[PDB]
Amino acid sequence: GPRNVATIPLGQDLTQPPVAGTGVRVTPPLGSLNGAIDLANLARPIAGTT
Amino acid sequence: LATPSPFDMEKMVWLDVNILEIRKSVLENFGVDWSKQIPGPFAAFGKDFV
């Protein structure tokens, strides 16, 4: 699975709190299933497979 | 000294025409149609040696 890490964006003030970031993470292209499976709201370390 | 008739009396002809037509058709569309192209597995790797 992907990793969830804390990252600081480039060009941001150093005192500002970090934000959420990831390791290598793939969002596959849903060819004919596009719009049928929700990817925006999916928790990437997938809990609930079926 | 003889003269011709103004015109000649022709025989009269009666025509009787019959046109008959019958069309028939059947159309059926039944069963279950499934998806035949679905996304496949994915893999990705990333590293920073230096």
Per the DSSP assignment, residues forming a β-bridge with A22 are: A4
Look at A24 and B45 and tell me if their CB atoms are within 8 Å: yes
**Residue A44: exposure state from Cβ atoms within 10 A (0-12, 13-18, ≥19):** middle
A41: alpha, beta or left, given left = phi > 0 and alpha = psi -120 to 50? Answer: alpha
Residues of chain A contacting B48 with CB distance shorter than 8 Å: none
- Stated in angstroms to one decimal place, the resolution of this structure is 2.4
**Residues A46, A3: Cα–Cα separation, whole Å:** 12
Report the alpha-carbon angle A43-A36-A4, nearest 5: 15
How was this structure determined? It was done by cryo-EM
Judge whether B39 and A31 are in contact, CB under 8 Å: yes
